[PDB]
Write a protein that holds these residues in place. Structure first.
Motif, mmCIF file in Angstrom:
data_model
loop_
_atom_site.group_PDB
_atom_site.id
_atom_site.type_symbol
_atom_site.label_atom_id
_atom_site.label_comp_id
_atom_site.label_asym_id
_atom_site.label_seq_id
_atom_site.Cartn_x
_atom_site.Cartn_y
_atom_site.Cartn_z
ATOM 1 N N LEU A 166 50.778 -23.766 20.783
ATOM 2 C CA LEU A 166 51.046 -23.892 22.214
ATOM 3 C C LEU A 166 52.531 -24.105 22.490
ATOM 4 O O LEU A 166 53.054 -23.609 23.493
ATOM 5 C CB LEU A 166 50.219 -25.027 22.821
ATOM 6 C CG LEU A 166 48.803 -24.772 23.363
ATOM 7 C CD1 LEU A 166 48.883 -24.030 24.692
ATOM 8 C CD2 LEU A 166 47.882 -24.031 22.399
ATOM 9 N N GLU A 167 53.230 -24.829 21.610
ATOM 10 C CA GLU A 167 54.671 -24.990 21.776
ATOM 11 C C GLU A 167 55.414 -23.684 21.526
ATOM 12 O O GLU A 167 56.457 -23.439 22.143
ATOM 13 C CB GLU A 167 55.196 -26.088 20.850
ATOM 14 C CG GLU A 167 55.044 -27.502 21.399
ATOM 15 C CD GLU A 167 55.196 -27.576 22.907
ATOM 16 O OE1 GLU A 167 56.332 -27.423 23.402
ATOM 17 O OE2 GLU A 167 54.177 -27.790 23.599
ATOM 18 N N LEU A 168 54.898 -22.839 20.631
ATOM 19 C CA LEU A 168 55.493 -21.516 20.463
ATOM 20 C C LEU A 168 55.122 -20.573 21.605
ATOM 21 O O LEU A 168 55.892 -19.662 21.928
ATOM 22 C CB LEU A 168 55.077 -20.917 19.122
ATOM 23 C CG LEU A 168 56.157 -20.999 18.046
ATOM 24 C CD1 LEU A 168 55.623 -20.517 16.716
ATOM 25 C CD2 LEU A 168 57.365 -20.185 18.467
ATOM 26 N N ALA A 169 53.957 -20.773 22.219
ATOM 27 C CA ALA A 169 53.450 -19.892 23.263
ATOM 28 C C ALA A 169 53.806 -20.345 24.673
ATOM 29 O O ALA A 169 53.420 -19.670 25.634
ATOM 30 C CB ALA A 169 51.928 -19.774 23.141
ATOM 31 N N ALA A 198 56.232 -17.872 27.275
ATOM 32 C CA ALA A 198 55.627 -16.651 27.787
ATOM 33 C C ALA A 198 54.540 -16.923 28.817
ATOM 34 O O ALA A 198 54.069 -15.979 29.458
ATOM 35 C CB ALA A 198 55.058 -15.817 26.637
ATOM 36 N N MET A 199 54.131 -18.184 28.985
ATOM 37 C CA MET A 199 53.213 -18.531 30.065
ATOM 38 C C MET A 199 53.889 -18.423 31.424
ATOM 39 O O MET A 199 53.227 -18.115 32.422
ATOM 40 C CB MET A 199 52.674 -19.949 29.874
ATOM 41 C CG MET A 199 51.946 -20.189 28.563
ATOM 42 S SD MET A 199 50.975 -18.781 28.013
ATOM 43 C CE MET A 199 49.904 -19.568 26.812
ATOM 44 N N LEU A 238 46.484 -16.000 22.273
ATOM 45 C CA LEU A 238 46.622 -16.988 23.343
ATOM 46 C C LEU A 238 47.396 -16.429 24.532
ATOM 47 O O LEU A 238 47.044 -16.700 25.691
ATOM 48 C CB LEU A 238 47.309 -18.244 22.809
ATOM 49 C CG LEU A 238 46.435 -19.231 22.037
ATOM 50 C CD1 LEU A 238 47.294 -20.316 21.413
ATOM 51 C CD2 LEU A 238 45.381 -19.833 22.948
ATOM 52 N N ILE A 239 48.457 -15.661 24.265
ATOM 53 C CA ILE A 239 49.224 -15.046 25.347
ATOM 54 C C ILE A 239 48.380 -14.001 26.066
ATOM 55 O O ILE A 239 48.434 -13.890 27.296
ATOM 56 C CB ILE A 239 50.546 -14.450 24.825
ATOM 57 C CG1 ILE A 239 51.421 -15.527 24.197
ATOM 58 C CG2 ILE A 239 51.346 -13.843 25.961
ATOM 59 C CD1 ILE A 239 51.748 -16.655 25.127
ATOM 60 N N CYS A 240 47.558 -13.249 25.319
ATOM 61 C CA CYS A 240 46.633 -12.302 25.942
ATOM 62 C C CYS A 240 45.628 -13.006 26.847
ATOM 63 O O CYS A 240 45.380 -12.556 27.975
ATOM 64 C CB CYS A 240 45.898 -11.501 24.871
ATOM 65 S SG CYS A 240 46.839 -10.139 24.185
ATOM 66 N N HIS A 289 47.531 -14.501 29.919
ATOM 67 C CA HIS A 289 48.110 -13.458 30.754
ATOM 68 C C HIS A 289 47.040 -12.686 31.510
ATOM 69 O O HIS A 289 47.243 -12.316 32.672
ATOM 70 C CB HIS A 289 48.941 -12.515 29.890
ATOM 71 C CG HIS A 289 49.451 -11.320 30.625
ATOM 72 N ND1 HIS A 289 50.587 -11.353 31.404
ATOM 73 C CD2 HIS A 289 48.975 -10.056 30.705
ATOM 74 C CE1 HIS A 289 50.792 -10.159 31.929
ATOM 75 N NE2 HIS A 289 49.827 -9.355 31.520
ATOM 76 N N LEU A 290 45.902 -12.407 30.872
ATOM 77 C CA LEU A 290 44.850 -11.707 31.596
ATOM 78 C C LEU A 290 44.063 -12.638 32.506
ATOM 79 O O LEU A 290 43.520 -12.187 33.520
ATOM 80 C CB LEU A 290 43.910 -11.004 30.623
ATOM 81 C CG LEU A 290 44.460 -9.741 29.963
ATOM 82 C CD1 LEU A 290 43.348 -9.041 29.241
ATOM 83 C CD2 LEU A 290 45.110 -8.810 30.967
#
Ligand SMILES: [Zn+2]
Length: 635
Positions: A7-10, A13-14, A35-37, A40-41
RNA sequence: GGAUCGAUCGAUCGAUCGGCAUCGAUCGGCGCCGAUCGAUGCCGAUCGAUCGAUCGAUCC
């Protein structure tokens, strides 16, 4: 399960800004991308839909990513497909893209689509993810997608542009020596991939290192052989082979320009290749003895290259491995020709073989590099009896050869066949991987070692400056993370605007097609194959001949690995049809239903009719002539 | 077949440093010698750009 590290790496991009994230593992990168997918969706309200596209460079990572993306997207009502080379023809790609969201296509398909006219803009996609994202450097399919996006963005017709997040384990340094140069390279990557954030671990560093490989470098600079009797004998063999090769050319030294051509080195191989490409443009106007001297010389230079590869093997692998390599070459080349040249060289090899087998069977002439490689392999297999050793060599000719030494040395018995239940795997490029050994070259179970065995200190200094470059890259990553966002955005806008301007500067116009009907000759044989009027280009890449007189000018041989590339299907490999030529020409293919062989300009030479000059080419794009497209209505 | 990447190496050009050889300017001592500066050719160490070869890997 998503932890605080992912989550800290992601996190960045949120928000909705593009990233060049860096995770040292593969499963963590996959989980962050998933997680980004998901986020994001799930952020889109009702009435709109997202089109997050994943890019995978290679087929096995594409299959792994397609399996993971199909497995996770089951409870969210999200459809998943992936396109590849065997999937490319099947159904048309516009119906796949317009009726799905999570396309996991390999990037060359999208490059071909945006070159063709399908996928009219990149604004259909709403997020773009780049697996192994530091490949976006120069002319890559990832870079071709990014050039298309930058021409769409900076051209003024930007619409709903997609987010351009990335995925890598190393940013890379390149040709940077100072910290300003490393900062310039990382900013150049961030501007070419068009991002203002570099996400890396800054707080949860304690749980990061539980999966990090963390190598232990153990360089061993160990000297080479002293008693070089095999090198003396085969060096005399190159000496009198070249001396008898000068009976047909009085200016062999004037053909090339690479001096200091000592035997057993890559410089000698470069000299051999250069003198072969220099002789290959021979234009003596007798046209009957010319084929004879070209065939004879080609046999001389292939023998010379085979001898040089034999001493490269004998320098790295065993003496006997060089002996079987030369014997296998002579056995395979004895069936191809039976002229005076081939018989003379073969009888010279058997007149040397009586002392060659005596020298190679002597146990006092073993390579010291193989001796202490056996010593370190013995001591690491004695320390732990479940070590999977990866062995990196320079060439595939060593890949079996060291393996035969593994099958030849009696002091080791725990090494098992692993040429690429396998104890040691020997390869050239890329699992447990408990031990890595780099023999003259430059996973799990943390606590691994990376031995490097070199007879030159330049590789040791290259690895030392590689470690310095890694430390300096991490320092420049922290320096770029310390910077403000708006200044970084202005910097990447300036760098990518300069990149787009210098890209539009190197837009060469259409070259003119030469009006003469040039004739193609063999590389080693110099026979009339076909004229360029009968040469038709099929899909702007592949070239073939529809001539009826060409059909009897070649012969067929069964292909070892047929594989359907694009819309073509391989059937066989074609060769020259003469007495003792047997040179490669191209490949027998079927396009849809026809059987029209496709040739390569790499194994041909081009001669004009009027001037008569013979030209040497390696790729079809360097050949500029009347490229008539292949019409199926003719044949 | 066609394209792409990486490692090593080679060629050309440019930049920094050092050494050898040569030509001029100034100071000092008894035409000779020591010091610095300016310029040219070659070699060695490093860096950058372009091209190429081999090897390996990848895709269509
Ligand atoms: Zn031929």
């Amino acid at each position: 399960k998503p932890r605080n590290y992912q989550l800290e790496l992601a996190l960045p991009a949120m928000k909705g800004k593009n990233t060049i994230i860096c995770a040292p593992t593969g499963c963590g990168k996959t989980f962050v991308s998933l997680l980004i997918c998901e986020h994001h969706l799930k952020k889109f309200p009702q009435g709109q839909k997202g089109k997050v596209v994943f890019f995978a460079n290679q087929i096995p990572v594409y299959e792994q990513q397609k399996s993971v993306f199909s497995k996770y997207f089951e409870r969210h009502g999200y459809r998943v497909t992936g396109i590849s080379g065997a999937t490319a023809e099947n159904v048309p790609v516009e119906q796949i893209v317009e009726n799905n969201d999570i396309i996991i296509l390999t990037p060359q398909i999208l490059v071909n689509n945006l070159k063709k006219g399908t996928i009219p803009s990149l604004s259909i996609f709403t997020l773009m993810i780049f697996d192994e994202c530091h490949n976006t450097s120069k002319q890559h399919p990832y870079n071709m997608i990014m050039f298309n996006y930058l021409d769409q963005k900076l051209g003024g017709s930007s619409g709903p542009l997609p987010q351009v997040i990335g995925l890598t384990a190393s940013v890379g340094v390149g040709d940077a020596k100072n910290t300003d140069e490393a900062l310039d390279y990382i900013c150049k990557l961030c501007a070419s991939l068009d991002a203002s954030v570099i996400a890396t671990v800054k707080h949860n560093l304690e749980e990061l290192e539980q999966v990090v490989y963390k190598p232990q470098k153990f360089f061993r600079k160990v000297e080479s052989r002293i008693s070089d009797k095999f090198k003396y004998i085969i060096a005399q063999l190159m000496r009198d082979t070249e001396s008898l090769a000068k009976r047909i050319c009085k200016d062999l030294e004037n053909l090339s320009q690479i001096q200091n051509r000592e035997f057993g080195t890559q410089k000698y191989e470069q000299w051999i290749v250069t003198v072969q490409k220099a002789c290959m443009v021979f234009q003596m106007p007798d046209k009957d003895e010319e084929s004879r001297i070209c065939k004879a010389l080609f046999l001389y230079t292939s023998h010379l290259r085979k001898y040089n590869d034999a001493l490269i093997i004998s320098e790295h692998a065993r003496m006997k491995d060089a002996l079987d390599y030369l014997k296998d070459f002579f056995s395979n080349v004895r069936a191809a020709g039976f002229d005076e040249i081939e018989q003379d060289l073969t009888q010279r090899f058997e007149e040397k073989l009586q002392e060659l087998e005596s020298v190679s069977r002597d146990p006092s002439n073993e390579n010291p590099k193989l001796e202490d490689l056996c010593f370190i392999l013995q001591e690491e297999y004695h320390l732990n009896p479940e070590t999977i050793t990866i062995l990196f060599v320079k060439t595939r000719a060593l890949v079996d050869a060291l393996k035969n030494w593994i099958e030849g040395n009696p002091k080791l018995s725990f090494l098992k066949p692993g040429i690429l239940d396998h104890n040691i795997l020997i390869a050239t490029s890329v699992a447990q991987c408990n031990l890595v050994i780099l023999y003259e070259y430059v996973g799990r179970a943390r606590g691994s070692k990376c031995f490097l065995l070199t007879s030159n200190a330049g590789v040791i200094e290259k690895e030392q400056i590689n470690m310095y470059k890694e430390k300096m890259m991490n320092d420049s990553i922290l320096r770029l993370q310390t910077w403000d966002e708006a200044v970084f955005r202005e910097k990447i806008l300036h760098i990518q605007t300069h990149e787009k301007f210098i890209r539009d500067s190197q837009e060469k116009p259409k070259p003119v097609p030469d009006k003469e009907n040039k004739k193609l000759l063999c590389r080693k044989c110099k026979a009339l194959a076909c004229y360029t009027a009968d040469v038709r280009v099929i899909e702007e890449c592949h070239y073939t001949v529809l001539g009826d007189a060409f059909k009897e000018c070649f012969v067929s041989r069964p292909h070892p690995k047929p594989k359907q590339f694009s819309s073509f299907e391989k059937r066989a490999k074609i060769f020259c049809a003469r007495q003792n030529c047997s040179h490669d020409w191209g490949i027998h293919v079927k396009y849809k239903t026809f059987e029209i062989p496709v040739i390569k300009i790499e194994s041909f030479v081009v001669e004009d009719i009027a001037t008569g000059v013979q030209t040497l080419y390696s790729k079809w794009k360097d050949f500029h002539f009347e490229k008539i497209p292949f019409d199926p209505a003719e044949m």
